[PDB]
Write a protein that binds this ligand. Structure first.
Ligand code: AIR
Ligand code: AIR
Ligand code: 5AD
Ligand code: 5AD
Ligand code: MET
Ligand code: MET
Ligand code: SF4
Ligand code: SF4
Ligand code: CL
Ligand code: CL
Ligand code: FE2
Ligand code: FE2
Lengths: 514, 514
């Protein structure tokens, strides 16, 4: 009821020379003024300031009070107008550009009509439960910037409410575009409430985890009714998207019998246990229409789970995995008939040569719905470094069109990630996501690389650091060998020294040619 | 003359449950017995021990004494037989399978005739100067395991002989297949001597660095003669390969005028400065034949430099870069006419969509000579994390056929890497190289992933750690939350806890189905 919340390091400490800014735009139908966040990096030497994306949200807000309910007037006005369904897809299909769509368009530097079109056709989603009034809207889709999710949450073995709220603020400081609260320990409802009220980014959950808690860990005591009540509980708090493993069908379970690592999905294994116990079809599949009815009233997006994802290179792209993908497509099309926003969850552990098949089949079988991958990890050999093994896969599958990359931290396979691991995972995934944006030739993505590289060539060291994903790491690393203030304007570093610095030699070469 | 050498952590500390082993094979022409190293990971639960590659070399050897001269009898016998040229390519073209070829074949689990064929056709090299008698032979080529190079060496600003020798032993402990001594500071000759006498892996250099030192940093005072004397000096010590920027032609230099980051190659910028000073063709290009004559007498392989590699995403795949690549192909074919072993150096900073063009053009224009890339870095945005930005590129270009991946450490663009950075870079690159082996479906590569994943599924925690690239990191990370001995056999970790562990649920599912 009153956790001992501690503040994360300030925006200014994390991003020296940056300021938080907002672009003001007017939603013309309503007259509502939207303040769309961005981060301005102030540079030297006559360079214009560099504007970048900003997920960090409002700063220095007491977590006991929570964030401003910025969407309140939007939601209240739409309610007063009256509507049969509350989803961004419903509105988009009516030809309506909502505040959320305009906010996202502004944030992406794209046309609001283009945003509306992408949402209406099911190729992008704006996860934005009407009860998450604190949310700064964002969009997930192949035509937009590649996004990153940070998974947090406690377990029965580790962590606390205070630490999980810290982790959400911290994850978003470093660039997480969404978070999920995957708590499987104590105080699931309360932890999630504190997170939602203090999160400017979309928050996802996997409702089956709490449903299993509601029945004291006895999977056989799950059923639709327990699950339904969990969905409503979570929707009422403002959860923006639910992972639901409705594609783990009874008949697909035996396809996993010869796998090396079996069913590694937590939710998938829970559904599989129930299905086998009763020899009955997955209750989330059976009640898909009823789930859609809930989602329509709040705008909860559905992230259709991949409970049969491969958990080892050995199992990659096997029959079980693709059987579920086929069903994910069926469920996607059914959700769209009710105007429910959908993305599809994907692998997993997948060696690089098997990555293209994953994207090809998803794009076709799921009608281009946004894809949301866990990595993939490209090799199993390096626990402790699975942020790297998976950054390779995530960058690759992102380049092929994957819209949301679920991070993997250095603690993958080993233990619950702490705040440091969360940062490491977010950084690795921001690298993968941006590398993918470059590969897709996404408009203006290279401007960031160019600004940093120009600062590098010109020996504007502080500008170089300020422009990077993690300024203080770059600065500290440089300063381990050359800490003096004068070195911040030196035309070399300790790698080559003054006489061998190649950019300084180029500098002399060009001066001589002048 | 007598540095204060300090020992690296022991093999046993780095690789718990592993032993160093050797496979004995007989070179039939000579009767020489070869002892080819490997590392055996001892496992539990009736698993056979897992045998892996091992670059760590002989352990606990006093650096003041140096390693055993294991190749002495091979070299002495060939000298007594008499030969006009001393290169592995010369021998291969005569139809001779040398000790080096058999050693490599054994190490790669491939046929010695296949090794001979690959070397004869120029598609693989065995860098193995006859004066590097301490060397455990290895092969670089697309048909073999993807290899990793670690760059070390001092600068005028940082490090020492003791620290550089430590770094070579340390780099190879973690998996470096070759190293380069890139020293640009004090005691270049001595540093390199200590390294060669204590390195079981091939050692490369960039001779122009020391040549520039010989003329007191005045590039205009370089010339062929200075360079020639440097080549002979380094060859006499046992350097296995030379990076020579002979493709930086006078007429290519103006192609860099509009680049964002100019010429980032150290050697390339030195050659460019000289060429512009005199308006004369690159002296290494002009004297290519004379360089080949030197290489033939020692078996120094040539790593044809890419002095015009791109140093920013902006500059990737530009005219300057590919002009040099075309010349690298000419130089390659010329070297082969004299039976000199060659690889080609490649980029650089290259966004992912531009990676395939790099491989396509190199394979064609350079007649499938082994390619040796620096990364590539797939984005410029994350100094401090360029081992990750480049692991993505290295894995990708490795998958397309690149044979040797030059590492990039977290200190790239920032300062001279220390011993910790060397480890981080090697690990990241071993991940990239192995991920590439998997993508190429290289024989038996997946056995490693499978063994670790089997240990993971079966909760053989110590086996899992022992099988990984960095066992103590994995173990320590797990133990941050579950340090008790009993947790090493627990069917969960702190990520999910006992009630939500998906592999344990799969375990129950399969037991129930039994
Ligand atoms: N993104 C993704 C793809 N596959 C799984 N996930 C993520 O993994 C979690 C669900 O895990 P599980 O399937 O193991 O219950 C959620 O964070 C979900 O988005
Ligand atoms: N592998 C590679 C590809 N391009 C450059 N390198 C490596 O970078 C160094 C040469 O650097 P430079 O060209 O800057 O003189 C040597 O380690 C060389 O193998
Ligand atoms: C299913 C994906 O989410 C990760 N995962 C599961 N639970 C948590 C948690 N509480 N915090 C962080 N990551 C988690 C898994 O390790 C896998 O990557
Ligand atoms: C040319 C490539 O080698 C790296 N490099 C240059 N000199 C050294 C050194 N002494 N030690 C380690 N890496 C070095 C550069 O940073 C680049 O990655
Ligand atoms: C549910 S925790 C374990 C998740 C597993 N590492 C995976 O690959 O999905
Ligand atoms: C010579 S030190 C700088 C090297 C540079 N970072 C490159 O991309 O090659
Ligand atoms: S010294 Fe080498 S690493 Fe440092 S700025 Fe110059 S070119 Fe870059
Ligand atoms: S608890 Fe989750 S992360 Fe840990 S071993 Fe089980 S499946 Fe893996
Ligand atoms: Cl696991
Ligand atoms: Cl640099
Ligand atoms: Fe996994
Ligand atoms: Fe660089």
């Amino acid at each position: 009821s009153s956790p001992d919340f501690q503040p994360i390091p300030s925006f200014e400490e994390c991003f020296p020379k940056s300021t938080k800014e907002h672009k003001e735009v007017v939603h013309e139908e309503s007259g509502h003024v939207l303040k769309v966040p961005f981060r301005r990096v102030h540079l030297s030497g006559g360079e214009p300031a560099f504007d970048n994306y900003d997920t960090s949200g409002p700063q220095n807000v007491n977590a006991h009070i929570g964030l401003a309910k910025l969407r309140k007037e939007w939601i209240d006005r739409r309610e007063k107008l009256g509507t049969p369904r509350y989803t961004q897809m419903y509105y988009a299909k009516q030809g309506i550009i909502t505040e959320e769509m305009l906010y996202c368009a502004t944030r992406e530097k794209l046309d609001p009509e283009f945003v509306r079109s992408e949402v209406a056709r099911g190729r992008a989603i704006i996860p934005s439960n009407k009860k998450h009034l604190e949310l700064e809207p964002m969009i997930v889709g192949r035509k937009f910037l590649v996004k990153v999710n940070a998974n947090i949450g406690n377990s029965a073995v580790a962590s606390s409410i205070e630490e999980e709220v810290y982790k959400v603020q911290w994850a978003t400081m470093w660039g997480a575009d969404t978070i999920m609260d995957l708590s499987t320990g104590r105080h699931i409802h309360e932890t999630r409430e504190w997170i939602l009220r203090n999160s400017a980014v979309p928050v996802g959950t996997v409702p089956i985890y709490q449903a299993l808690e509601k029945v004291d860990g006895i999977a056989e005591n799950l059923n639709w009714e327990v699950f339904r009540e969990t969905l409503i509980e979570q929707a009422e708090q403002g959860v923006d998207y639910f992972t639901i493993h409705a594609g783990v069908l009874l008949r697909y379970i035996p396809l996993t019998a010869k796998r090396l690592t079996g069913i590694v999905s937590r939710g998938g294994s829970i559904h599989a246990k129930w299905c086998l116990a009763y020899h009955k079809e997955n209750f989330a599949y059976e009640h898909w229409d009823d789930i859609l009815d809930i989602c329509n009233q709040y705008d909860v997006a559905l992230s259709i789970g991949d409970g049969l994802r491969p958990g080892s290179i050995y199992d990659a792209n096997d029959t079980a995995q693709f059987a579920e993908l086929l069903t994910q497509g069926e469920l996607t099309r059914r959700a769209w008939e009710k105007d429910v926003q959908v993305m599809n969850e994907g692998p997993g552990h997948v060696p690089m040569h098997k990555i293209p098949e994953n994207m090809q089949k998803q794009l076709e079988w799921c009608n281009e719905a946004p894809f949301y991958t866990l990595g993939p990890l490209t090799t199993d050999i390096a626990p402790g470094y699975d942020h790297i093994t998976s950054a390779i896969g995530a960058a690759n599958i992102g380049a092929l069109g994957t819209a949301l990359l679920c991070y993997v931290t250095p603690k993958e396979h080993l233990g619950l990630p702490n705040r440091d691991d969360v940062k490491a995972g977010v950084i690795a995934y921001k690298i993968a996501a941006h590398a993918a944006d470059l590969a897709k030739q996404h408009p203006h993505a290279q401007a960031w690389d160019d600004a940093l590289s120009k600062a590098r060539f010109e020996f504007r060291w502080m500008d170089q650091f300020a422009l990077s994903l993690d300024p203080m790491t770059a600065m500290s690393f440089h300063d381990e060998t050359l800490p003096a203030d004068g070195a911040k304007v030196a035309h070399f570093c300790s790698m080559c020294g003054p006489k061998f610095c190649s950019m300084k030699i180029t500098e002399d070469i060009r001066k001589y040619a002048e």
